[PDB]
Amino acid sequence: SEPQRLFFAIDLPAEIREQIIHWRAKHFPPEAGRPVAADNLHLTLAFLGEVSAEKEKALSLLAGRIRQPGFTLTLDDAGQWLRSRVVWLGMRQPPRGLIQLANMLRSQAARSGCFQSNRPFHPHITLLRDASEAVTIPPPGFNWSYAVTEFTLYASSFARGRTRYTPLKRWALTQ
């Protein structure tokens, strides 16, 4: 019925999310940029844009065909992209499983008509937006490492000046 704005993502366990926001607060004054709400911290795998109900169902079926092992993420990197004005967390050497999962979902989208940026996948978790000015970036905190067991399809909506993500479907990572 409803045409929705969709994306696939990896989520953060609550403890790591709490560590990230504490570290962010400690190292980045309000002036440095607009903080992403704690609940909204995530790692995007594929952005689908505006998707019809019929297209969403077809993409969800394809997502449900994916078979691959889970993997461990360890966030050992942080940086700023002036181009899109964000400060982010990431990995120096992302696990093969993450790259493969992202490529798979993007490939499924593209083959389904959903335009995908030719820009090489750069997995990241945005912490600050509208960070239009260069700022000092400390290394991430110690031991921000966890097992990824699932990925999730989200819908994105905006009202009241706050963006909300609503989970639609989840899939476990299984061989």
Ligand X SMILES: Nc1ncnc2c1ncn2[C@@H]1O[C@H](COP(=O)(O)OP(=O)(O)OP(=O)(O)O)[C@@H](O)[C@H]1O
Instruction: Please give the positions annotated as active site.
Output: 42, 124
Task: Give yes or no for residue 147 binding Cl ion (CB under 5 A).
Answer: no
Determine the size of the site formed for ligand X (CB under 6 A): 8
Give the DSSP letter string of 56-102.
HHHHHHHHTT-----EEEE--EEEEETTTTEEEEE-SS--HHHHHHH
Select the residue interacting with ligand X from 17, 21, 27, 44 (CB under 6 A).
Answer: 44
Residues 94-153 that bind ligand X (CB under 6 A): 117
Per-residue binder mask for Cl ion (CB under 5 A), 67-96, x = binder: ------------xx----------------
The CB-of-157 to Cl ion minimum distance in angstroms stands at 12
Q: Which does 156 bind (CB under 5 to 8 A by kind): Cl ion, ligand X, none?
A: ligand X
Q: Are 88 and 124 in contact (CB under 8 A)?
A: yes
Give the sign of the dihedral formed by CA 109, CA 113, CA 118, CA 124.
negative
Q: Which does 17 bind (CB under 5 to 8 A by kind): Cl ion, ligand X, none?
A: none
For 155, counting Cβ atoms within 10 Å of its Cβ (0-12 exposed, 13-18 middle, 19+ buried), the class is middle
